[PDB]
Amino acid sequence: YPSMEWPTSLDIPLKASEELVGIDLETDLPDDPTDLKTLLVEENSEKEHWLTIALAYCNHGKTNEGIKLIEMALDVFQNSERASLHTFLTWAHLNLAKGQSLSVETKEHELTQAELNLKDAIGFDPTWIGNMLATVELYYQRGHYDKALETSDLFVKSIHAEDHRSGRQSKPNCLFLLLRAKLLYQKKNYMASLKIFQELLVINPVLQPDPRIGIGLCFWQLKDSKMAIKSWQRALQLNPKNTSASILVLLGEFRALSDLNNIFSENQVLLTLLQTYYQLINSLYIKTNVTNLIQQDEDLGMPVDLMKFPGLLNKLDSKLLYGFDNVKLDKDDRILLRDP
Ligand code: NI
Ligand code: NI
Ligand code: NI
């Protein structure tokens, strides 16, 4: 398959001489990012290096450190050079805000921090795709689905208008499509949603988040529970760290029994599963409950995270948002292109 893996090391050009200090992004980052700040400031390092480093923290479980670094960068870079620092801070706070167990206030507190940085970013660079996507993602995360879909639809018209103005053909943007597919599913238009998720599978079969999660949720809401489960097992196969896939595969296959999956649910919901330990009125109760909690995550198991796109938040290169042009679409993926 195609590859969206981040460069795994960084060379910082030293200021006085012309040697380069190499950093292994996966083991060389210190617990206190101030150490690099010293280096980065001292050697007059370029801004994109601050970003690349902060993204390494975030993508290796260290978002607080990622945030601490770019917040320090804000004391170094001036005026318009601060825009892309604010964009990073927007997406870092959107990632925080997706925290699995935040109370509605902590969520909104993090989303406010994102919005504040977003305002500073758009003030300098309103047409940057990183800032436009964040505007839509903020509406989504706040549940304002109608405004999100309407803002999305204005944005793609704008970009289309812009391609006439530069004599270019438009290329579908995977995250605008992903946002549309998710908004459509919120509006219960599961058929239009499913088509977009399937479009995404052929454009970028290594897209994060996995559009197969959405493929399965569309099948499920369209009552083809057999294929929903196949989409989800394909997701969990290509990436066994996908917790959302895991919980969906087991909640789906779980339609004695209520022991076999509490033990499989401890490997990687477990509350209400234990509430359901409390004429088969009962079988419809466990059935309803499994359905309710398969639908409990308003994020649909597909968190939109710009930190999964090499070059995007650290170099203003949005190329990877358009995916790949040859589709070796594997046997177990091409199945998922089918109708219900
Ligand atoms: Ni914060
Ligand atoms: Ni905070
Ligand atoms: Ni046109």
mmCIF file of C-alpha atoms and ligand atoms in Angstrom, residues 93 96 109-110 113, ligand 1:
data_model
loop_
_atom_site.group_PDB
_atom_site.id
_atom_site.type_symbol
_atom_site.label_atom_id
_atom_site.label_comp_id
_atom_site.label_asym_id
_atom_site.label_seq_id
_atom_site.Cartn_x
_atom_site.Cartn_y
_atom_site.Cartn_z
ATOM 1 C CA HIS A 93 -6.219 21.454 21.337
ATOM 2 C CA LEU A 96 -6.896 17.076 23.482
ATOM 3 C CA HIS A 109 -12.552 24.459 27.596
ATOM 4 C CA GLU A 110 -10.077 22.748 25.253
ATOM 5 C CA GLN A 113 -8.408 27.183 23.417
HETATM 6 NI NI NI B 1 -4.805 24.052 26.763
#
